[PDB]
Amino acid sequence: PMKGRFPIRRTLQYLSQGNVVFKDSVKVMTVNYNTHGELGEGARKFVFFNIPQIQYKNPWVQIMMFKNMTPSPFLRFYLDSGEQVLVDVETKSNKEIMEHIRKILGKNEETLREEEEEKKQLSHPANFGPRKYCLRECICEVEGQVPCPSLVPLPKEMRGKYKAALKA
Amino acid sequence: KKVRPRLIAELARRVRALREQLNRPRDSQLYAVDYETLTRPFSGRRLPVRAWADVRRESRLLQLLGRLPLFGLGRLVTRKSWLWQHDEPCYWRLTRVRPDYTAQNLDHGKAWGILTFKGKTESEAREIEHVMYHDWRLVPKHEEEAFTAFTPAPEDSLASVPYPPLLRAMIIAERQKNGDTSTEEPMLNVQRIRMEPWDYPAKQEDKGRAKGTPV
Amino acid sequence: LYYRRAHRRFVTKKALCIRVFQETQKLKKRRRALKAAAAAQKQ
Amino acid sequence: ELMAWNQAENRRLHELRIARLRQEEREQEQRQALEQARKAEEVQAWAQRKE
Amino acid sequence: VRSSVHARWIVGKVIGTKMQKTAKVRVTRLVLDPYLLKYFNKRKTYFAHDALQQCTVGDIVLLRALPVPRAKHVKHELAEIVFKVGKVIDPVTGKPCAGTTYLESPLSSE
Amino acid sequence: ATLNQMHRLGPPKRPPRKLGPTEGRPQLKGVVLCTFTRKPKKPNSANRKCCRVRLSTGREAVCFIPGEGHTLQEHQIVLVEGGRTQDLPGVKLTVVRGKYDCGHVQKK
RNA sequence: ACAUUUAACUAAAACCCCUACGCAUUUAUAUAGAGGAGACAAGUCGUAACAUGGUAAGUGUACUGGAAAGUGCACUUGGACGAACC
RNA sequence: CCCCACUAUGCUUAGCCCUAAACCUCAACAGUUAAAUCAACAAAACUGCUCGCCAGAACACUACGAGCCACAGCUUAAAACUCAAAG
RNA sequence: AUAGGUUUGGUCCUAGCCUUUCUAUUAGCUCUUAGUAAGAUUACACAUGCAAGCAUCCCCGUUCCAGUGAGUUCACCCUCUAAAUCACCACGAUCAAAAGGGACAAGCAUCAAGCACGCAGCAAUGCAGCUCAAAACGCUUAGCCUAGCCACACCCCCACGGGAAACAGCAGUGAUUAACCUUUAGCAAUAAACGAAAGUUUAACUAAGCUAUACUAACCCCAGGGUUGGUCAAUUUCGUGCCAGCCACCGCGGUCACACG
Ligand SMILES: NC(=O)c1ccc[n+]([C@@H]2O[C@H](COP(=O)([O-])OP(=O)(O)OC[C@H]3O[C@@H](n4cnc5c(N)ncnc54)[C@H](O)[C@@H]3O)[C@@H](O)[C@H]2O)c1
Ligand SMILES: [K+]
Ligand SMILES: [K+]
Ligand SMILES: [K+]
Ligand SMILES: [K+]
Ligand SMILES: [K+]
Ligand SMILES: [K+]
Ligand SMILES: [K+]
Ligand SMILES: [K+]
Ligand SMILES: [K+]
Ligand SMILES: [K+]
Ligand SMILES: [K+]
Ligand SMILES: [Mg+2]
Ligand SMILES: [Mg+2]
Ligand SMILES: [Mg+2]
Ligand SMILES: [Mg+2]
Ligand SMILES: [Mg+2]
Ligand SMILES: [Mg+2]
Ligand SMILES: [Mg+2]
Ligand SMILES: [Mg+2]
Ligand SMILES: [Mg+2]
Ligand SMILES: [Mg+2]
Ligand SMILES: [Mg+2]
Ligand SMILES: [Mg+2]
Ligand SMILES: [Mg+2]
Ligand SMILES: [Mg+2]
Ligand SMILES: [Mg+2]
Ligand SMILES: [Mg+2]
Ligand SMILES: [Mg+2]
Ligand SMILES: [Mg+2]
Ligand SMILES: [Mg+2]
Ligand SMILES: [Mg+2]
Ligand SMILES: [Mg+2]
Ligand SMILES: [Mg+2]
Ligand SMILES: [Mg+2]
Ligand SMILES: [Mg+2]
Ligand SMILES: [Mg+2]
Ligand SMILES: [Mg+2]
Ligand SMILES: [Mg+2]
Hints:
The structure is cut from a larger assembly and holds chains A, B, C, D, E and F.
Chain D: H1 2-50
Chain E: E1 9-19, E2 22-32, E3 39-49, E4 60-65, E5 74-83, E6 88-89, E7 96-98, E8 101-102
Parallel strand pairs in E: 3-5
Antiparallel strand pairs in E: 1-2, 1-4, 2-3, 4-5, 6-7, 7-8
Chain F: H1 3-9, E1 27-38, E2 48-55, E3 60-64, E4 77-81, E5 93-95
The structure holds nicotinamide-adenine-dinucleotide, potassium ion (K) (11 copies) and magnesium ion (MG) (27 copies).
Chain B binds three RNA strands through helix 1 and helix 3.
GO molecular function, one term (chain B): structural constituent of ribosome
Family (chain B): Belongs to the mitochondrion-specific ribosomal protein mS34 family.
Function (chain B): Required for mitochondrial translation, plays a role in maintaining the stability of the small ribosomal subunit and the 12S rRNA that are required for mitoribosome formation.
C-alpha cells in the first residue's frame, strides 16, 4: 500500500480540494504551532492536513513552520504592503482555522469564477490548427467542404497534374 | 551562467566601425556614372531604363552651384521632374552647401534649403535630397519673381466620407442596442488626413548611405 | 559546517592557495602605486 | 474591514485566555501548597535523622 | 516601489554574521515532490544588508527586497527581526517567553 | 525505504543499456579473414562452419555461417547480422545469406 | 605601448599599434614483456568438500606446502553428543 | 592426521595495525495481541516513525582511482567477455 | 498485462532471461493500380547550372526565406528600456534587444573539496570572506520543453587577422555507411523584396518526377513471405544417422526425427 499514515494526503485529488486561494497581497505565511498540549490540537491538525492543500493552491507563497517557540499557536501573514496579519489559532479546530483564513485573506468564489472565464476565451472554437490547441486541423474536416485528397481523391479537373494537360 | 567573454568579436567591431569612418567613399566616387554604358563604376550597377534619358540631358545640383559666387546661397533651384508634373512653383531656397572638395569639378556634395512645394513654403530649412540626380535646374535671377508668382487656390475639399457597407451596419446596430435613437449617418472625418503627393521631398536626414565596398 | 577529513594533499594544496592569494594581493597594490606615480607626472 | 474583524477576534480570544490562565494559577497554587507541605515534612524527618 | 529583485518578502534564519553589515540568511520553501506528492523543504541562501549589524546567528528575520541590488549577492535588506534568538516575545500576548513557558505571566499586567 | 529516503534518492537510475556485437546496428559489412569450424558445447556435437571477419568498425569477430555449404574465402565481403548461435559460446554474429559474396544455399 | 591637432564670411577636415603555440598542457588508442578472469563431450596428479566425507565444517589472521590444502590462536553453528535414573 | 623436542607467538611496558560466522546473520524508539495468525524452515504475527542497506549468477573480500603510522595491508569499489540459471 | 515459457527427481518461494502487443530503420524473398503523406548514414570532399533584386539615379533589400544538428541550460517569467510598426512632432499601444533578478537536460561522488570563487566605504582603504554531500568544482553524453524554439553557417568558440579557397540553398556527384529521390516546370496561388503604382524578381513556394517507408481506396486478369515439438494457430511420406543441419526460450539430430533437408 501507499506509505505513511493518511496516504490520501499524497494524492492530486486531495491536494486540489483546498478552498483557500490567497489574494495577491499575501507573500509569506509563518505557522507557529506547539507539538504537545490539548489546546494546540487544531494547529497540529491544520499543519498535518491543510498546509499541503494551501501550498498547492498558492505555489508562490512562502510557508515556513516553527515548532515550540511560543506558549500558544498562531499564524502570521506578511502582505506585500508591509502589513502583518496575526491570527491566533489556539483552541480552534483545523477546519475553523481554514475557514477563518479564507474569509480574511482568500479570494471569493466570484473572483475565481471570473479568472476561469478569462481562460476560456484563450481557446477559440473557430480557429484551425494542431489538436493540442484547436478542435479541428483543417477545413476539410467540416462536412460539406471539399474532403481531404488523402481520403477522397479530387476530380481530375481540379488536380494540377491534369489542369495543365487540358490547357496544353 | 557566466558567459565566456568574446574579445575578438568586440575588437573587430571597433576596427570595422573605425575603418568605415576613415575609408568612407566620397560622393565623387559613389555617385559617379559612365555616360556611355550608364553604369556607376563604383558598384558596376546599371541605372534604371527610365533614368537613362535625363542622366544624359540634365545637370546635378552642384554641377550648377559650382559656377556661382557662394554656391548659390539664397538662390532658387527647381527640378525638371517637378516642372513636368506640377503647375505650381516647386523650388528650394538654398541656405547651406557642403561641397565635395575631392571632385575635380566640385560637382558633388550636399545642400540645405527651405522647401516650397506647390506654393506652400515650409517654415524651416532642411537637408535637400536627390542632390546627385540629373534633374535640377537653376532659376535665373530676372525670372525669380514671375517664377514664384502663385495664387493660392480655394482649399475646398471633402471633409467626410461614408463608412464602408459592413462597418456602417455595425455602428448603427450599436446605437440601437444601447438605446440611442438617431437617424444621422456615420461618416469618417478625412479632414485630418492630409494626403501628400508621392513625389514630395522626403527627409534626407533619415536617409541612409551606400557602403564603402568599391568595384 | 562540514565533516570531511583533511588529508595531506588537501592540507598542502590549501596552504599554497592561501599563499598564492597573499602574493597576488601584494601585486595588486604594486600596480596601484605605479599607476599613481605616472598620473602625478603628467601634471 | 476584514483586518479589523480579525483583530476583534484576536481580542476576544485573548479575553478567554486570561480567564483560563487565572483558573490554572488557582490550581497551581493549591498543588504547590500540598507539595510544600510534603517537602517540609520530608526535610524535617530527614534533618532529625542526621541530627 | 518597483523592484528588479524577484523575491519581494522572505522570512529566513540567520546563519552567518561574518561579513560587515551583511547577514547571511537561510530561507526555506516547501516544494512538491512530483512523484511522491509530498512537500519537502528547499533552502536558499540570501545576503541581507544589515546597517546596524544587529542580527545574531539563529534569529528569524524578515527581508525586504532592495529596489536594486547594492552588491553582487546583496539584493535584500533586513526589514525586521521576527524572533530574536533566545529573546522571543509572544506576539499573541506580548510577553517574554522561553520556549513554551511564559517568563512573565500574561496576568501580571492584566 | 522511507518517503524521505525515496525523495533523497530520486527515481531509479536506469542501468545503461549495453550495445551488443553490432553496436546497436542492424547489420555490419565485413571482410573474411579465415574460415574454420567450431565444436558445440554439451550436449551437442557438430563441426559448425564459422569465419573470422574484420568488421567495418575495425573490430574482428567470429561469425557463424548458416546453411548447408558455403563458398566463402579470405578477402571476401559479407554482411553480418545479430543473433547468437546457441550452441557456440561467444559466437554472436551470423553471416547473411544472399548478400555480397555469400550466396543463397543451393537447393538440396 | 599610444596624442589633441588643423579649421571656423555657410562649415568641416584629420584619426588605422604590437605581443601566443611549444614535442609544452589534456585525454585516449596501439605494446617488447608480464599476468588475471570466463568458457570449453570424453588429458595428467592427488582426493580438499558433500555422511561424524572417514582429522566436523567455516570465519579472521599468521606461517607452511606440487595441487587441492595443513597447522597455530580466537570466534561461529550454517555439526553432533544418542536427550528419566543406571 | 598420531608421538617427541624446541622457536615466533600467547604475558608486561610503550606505540601501531583496525580485521572476524565482530552472527543472538533478527536496526533505534513507541505500541499491539485484535483478524486472513501465517509460502517453507527458523526464534508467532503485526502497526507507527526514522536512519542504514539491497535490486539475476559469476567476474569480485578483484582491477583502477583515492585515503590511511597500514608498503605481501585495510577501507571504498567497477567494467569487458560468459551464462539461463544461481539461490 | 488478464498474462505465458524456463531452475528441480519432484514441490513451494524468490529471481533473471525470454514469449505474446505496438511502432521505426536495414536485410532476404516477393510485388498490380490510384490518391495522399514522408523521404543521404556522414558539420566528410564537391564538377556543372541556378537560388536577390527592385527602382527616374538616392535609398531600400540581399541581416529574410531556405539548410543543418556541430556545439549546448543564450529559449521561459519579472524588471527596465533601445531599435522597429502605427504617414509625420506627438501619444500611448504593439513588438522585442542589451542590462538586472528568478527558473530550467541526462549519467558519474572511483569528479569531494573549489582556489579568490566575498562584503563594507563617496573614495582612500578596511575586513577575510564566498560556494559545497540539500552535491560546489569537474568529466561524459545529448539539440530542445515541437503552432515552434535554440545554436551553427569551412576551420581557429569570436574573425581585426590567419589556415585557406568553403552546396549543413536547389538539382546532382565522389568517398563513406546496414542506410542511396530528378543535374523537372512555373512565378498562375500564397509569402517575401522593391516601386506612388501598372508591375518585376524569388530552387520560398506551387504543380509534377522517383521510392511498398506509411495511410486510403481498388482490382475481370494476376500471391507471395514466414511458420507447422511446447510456449503458439497449423505435417504426410522419404533422405540423413550427435553427421549434415536447426533453435526467440526450453531444446532437436547417436538407424522408425510430427524439431534437420
Ligand atoms: N557531508 C557533510 O559534511 C554533511 C553536512 C551536513 C549534513 N550531512 C548529512 O549527512 C548525511 C549523509 O550525507 P551523504 O550521503 O552525502 O554522506 P556519505 O555517507 O556519502 O559521506 C560523504 C561525506 O559526508 C560525511 N557524512 C556522512 N554521514 C554524515 C552525517 N550523518 N552527518 C554529517 N556528515 C556525514 C562523511 O564524513 C563524508 O565526508 C545526510 O543526511 C546529510 O544531510 C552531511
Ligand atoms: K550428445
Ligand atoms: K544433442
Ligand atoms: K578438511
Ligand atoms: K561437515
Ligand atoms: K552466530
Ligand atoms: K518468471
Ligand atoms: K522489405
Ligand atoms: K529600390
Ligand atoms: K546538435
Ligand atoms: K563555430
Ligand atoms: K507569384
Ligand atoms: Mg537464429
Ligand atoms: Mg604482449
Ligand atoms: Mg576427503
Ligand atoms: Mg574432513
Ligand atoms: Mg579450522
Ligand atoms: Mg583461513
Ligand atoms: Mg605443517
Ligand atoms: Mg547441517
Ligand atoms: Mg617463547
Ligand atoms: Mg562475538
Ligand atoms: Mg551483520
Ligand atoms: Mg541506528
Ligand atoms: Mg577480508
Ligand atoms: Mg582490495
Ligand atoms: Mg590501488
Ligand atoms: Mg521607440
Ligand atoms: Mg535578454
Ligand atoms: Mg555518499
Ligand atoms: Mg575506477
Ligand atoms: Mg552532438
Ligand atoms: Mg560543407
Ligand atoms: Mg565562425
Ligand atoms: Mg544539395
Ligand atoms: Mg532509407
Ligand atoms: Mg511532390
Ligand atoms: Mg527416417
Ligand atoms: Mg522441417
